[PDB]
Amino acid sequence: MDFYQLPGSPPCRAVALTAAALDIEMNFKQVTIPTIDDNGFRLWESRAIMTYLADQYGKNDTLYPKDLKKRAIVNQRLYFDMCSLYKSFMDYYYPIIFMKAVKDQAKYENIGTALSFLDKFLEGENYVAGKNMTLADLSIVSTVSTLEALDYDLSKYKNVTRWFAKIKPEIPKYEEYNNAGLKMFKEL
Amino acid sequence: MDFYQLPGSPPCRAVALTAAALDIEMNFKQVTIPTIDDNGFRLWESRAIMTYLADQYGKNDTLYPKDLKKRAIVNQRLYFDMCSLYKSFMDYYYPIIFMKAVKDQAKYENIGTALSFLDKFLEGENYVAGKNMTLADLSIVSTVSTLEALDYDLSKYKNVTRWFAKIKPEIPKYEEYNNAGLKMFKEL
């Protein structure tokens, strides 16, 4: 399988973490990313890639439970991550980081709103979407760790901070496949 | 199953169309909508609801194929619909419809960009995400029909126009569960 990616890209790191958690080797290509080419099957949309890889190559279904109710909750969190959390991170930081535009306080507050929802999801919970670490944890951590790298303060979100701190040690190859690619953000 | 909804809401109509296509009766409640309460299982996020209902109550898997590659394409289109198509429709029309704010040309053009992607997906294709009508068709039609109801011109998007015209007759109970709720938009 070929993996077309960009080391800093949060969606790319979500896929890379997923491949690491499933112990899947991918041929990493550098250049809509990420895209995988799985023996001729081309697939884009990070989260669709993640759920495809889990079902097609997951030894057990802990990351993406076959049980339909548990799966629906993972799916619900993946939509939230993509449409609210990740989108709001992009909408505020990307113009600042790349276009050196002026900070937008309204877009900045959308980040806070998304995190408050995430913080509520994690109340009384070890993981974002069920009793075990799921794909939703790997997806969301790719954005949350990028916020921290950009010096967003998460301590107010004590469930987010709690979850983030305990999840990094559980994630296979977290340092190699997420932490490393964060260097571009820590330098700007 | 209880279905908490609002007749005009596009995500509510996407779920209602899904229930109609699967021949599922739901107890419709009026008030994050839509939400279903399936014998104590509460679930929000329209698209997560749609894929839950298809697997849990679908007689065959034509609407949401079990085949992992075909399923991944449906999933990819559902993310696009939610994050690009539906989001851009909301971002431009809702301030105009509800807050009577001034038209935003940038937000208006995002609609056009989303539709151009949809139009490309439908090139040479009968359906948005595979050889048969899938959940992605029901999701996207709930937004496309709302655009038309708001007098957005889709004729430029000749694949979108072609698909929309042939899909309305195929959708079980399309008139009752989507067309009817569109009346609020045609009057404003």
Query: How many Å apart are CA B132 and CA B146, to the nearest integer?
Result: 23
Nearest Cα neighbor of B137 from B184, B65, B182, B78 is: B78
**Total residue length of chain B:** 188
Query: How many Å apart are CA A52 and CA A178, to the nearest integer?
Result: 20
Helix/strand/coil (H/E/C) assignment for every residue in chain B: CEEEECCCCHHHHHHHHHHHHHCCCCEEEECCCCEEEECCEEEECHHHHHHHHHHHHCCCCCCCCCCHHHHHHHHHHHHHHHHHHHHHHHHHHHHHHHCCCCCCHHHHHHHHHHHHHHHHHCCCCCECCECCCCHHHHHHHHHHHHHHHCCCCCCCCHHHHHHHHHHHHHCCCHHHHHHHHHHHHHHC
Set of chain A residues whose Cβ sits within 8 Å of the Cβ of B56: 68
Show the tokens assigned to B103. 């038209």
Relative to beta strand A2-5, strand B41-44 is: unpaired
Give the C-alpha distances (Å, rounded to integers) separating B130 from A37, B52, B69.
18, 19, 10
B87: nearest CA partner in chain A: A83
Contact assignment for B75 to A51 by CB distance below 8 Å: yes
Query: How many Å apart are CA A67 and CA A90, to the nearest integer?
Result: 32
Contact assignment for B41 to A69 by CB distance below 8 Å: yes
| Homologous superfamily, domain A2-59 | Glutaredoxin (3.40.30.10)
In chain B, CATH 1.20.1050.10 sits at 68-170
- Residue A36: strand pairing partners: A3, A43
Set of chain B residues whose Cβ sits within 8 Å of the Cβ of A72: 43, 48-49, 51-52
Residue A37 identity (one-letter amino acid): D
* Annotation marks residue A9 as catalytic: yes
Relative to beta strand B35-38, strand B2-5 is: antiparallel
Distance (Å) from the C-alpha of residue B114 to the closest C-alpha of chain A? 14
Angle between helices A68-80 and A135-149 (to 10 degrees): 20
Query: How many Å apart are CA A46 and CA A41, to the nearest integer?
Result: 15
Query: How many Å apart are CA A156 and CA B4, to the nearest integer?
Result: 32
Set of chain B residues whose Cβ sits within 8 Å of the Cβ of A55: 68, 71
Query: How many Å apart are CA A119 and CA A16, to the nearest integer?
Result: 25
Nearest Cα neighbor of B117 from B141, B78, B84 is: B84
Contact assignment for A87 to B82 by CB distance below 8 Å: no
Query: How many Å apart are CA B80 and CA B65, to the nearest integer?
Result: 18
Question: Out of A9, A88, A139, A145, which one is annotated catalytic?
Answer: A9
Alpha helices by DSSP H, chain A: 10-22, 46-57, 68-80, 87-98, 105-121, 135-149, 158-170, 174, 183-187
What is the arrangement of strands in the sheet containing A41-44, beginning at the earlier edge strand?
A: A27-30, A2-5, A35-38, A41-44
Query: How many Å apart are CA A168 and CA A20, to the nearest integer?
Result: 13
Asked if residues A85 and A118 have their Cβ atoms less than 8 Å apart, the reply is: yes
Other Cβ atoms less than 10 A from the Cβ of A41: the count is 14
Q: Write b or e for each residue in A12-40: b if 16 or more Cβ atoms lie within 10 A of its Cβ, otherwise e.
A: bbbbbbbbbbbebebeeeeeebbbbebee
Set of chain A residues whose Cβ sits within 8 Å of the Cβ of B83: 82-83, 87
Other Cβ atoms less than 10 A from the Cβ of B87: the count is 17
Please indicate if the annotation marks B140 as binding a ligand: no
Looking at chain B, the residues that come just before a C–N gap of over 2.5 A are 31
How many CB pairs below 8 Å do chains A and B form together? 66
Distance (Å) from the C-alpha of residue A123 to the closest C-alpha of chain B? 17
Contact assignment for B44 to A76 by CB distance below 8 Å: yes
CATH of the structural domain B68-170, one choice from 1.20.950.20, 1.20.1050.10, 3.20.20.140, 2.60.120.10: 1.20.1050.10
Query: How many Å apart are CA A175 and CA A70, to the nearest integer?
Result: 28
Nearest Cα neighbor of B41 from A83, A115, A159, A71 is: A71
- Experimental determination technique: X-ray
Contact assignment for B75 to A45 by CB distance below 8 Å: yes
Q: What is the resolution of this structure in A?
A: 2.0
For tokens 């081309």, the residue is: A42
Distance (Å) from the C-alpha of residue B34 to the closest C-alpha of chain A? 12
Please indicate if the annotation marks B49 as binding a ligand: no
The DSSP secondary-structure symbol of A82 reads: I
**Total residue length of chain A:** 188
| A43 φ, ψ (degrees, to nearest 5) | -145, 130
In chain B, CATH 3.40.30.10 sits at 2-59
A75: nearest CA partner in chain B: B48
Other Cβ atoms less than 10 A from the Cβ of A98: the count is 9
B79: Cβ contacts below 8 Å, ≥ 6 apart: A45, A47, A48, A79, A82
For tokens 């009057």, the residue is: B187
Contact assignment for B68 to A55 by CB distance below 8 Å: yes
Set of chain B residues whose Cβ sits within 8 Å of the Cβ of A43: 69, 72-73, 76
Residue B160 identity (one-letter amino acid): V
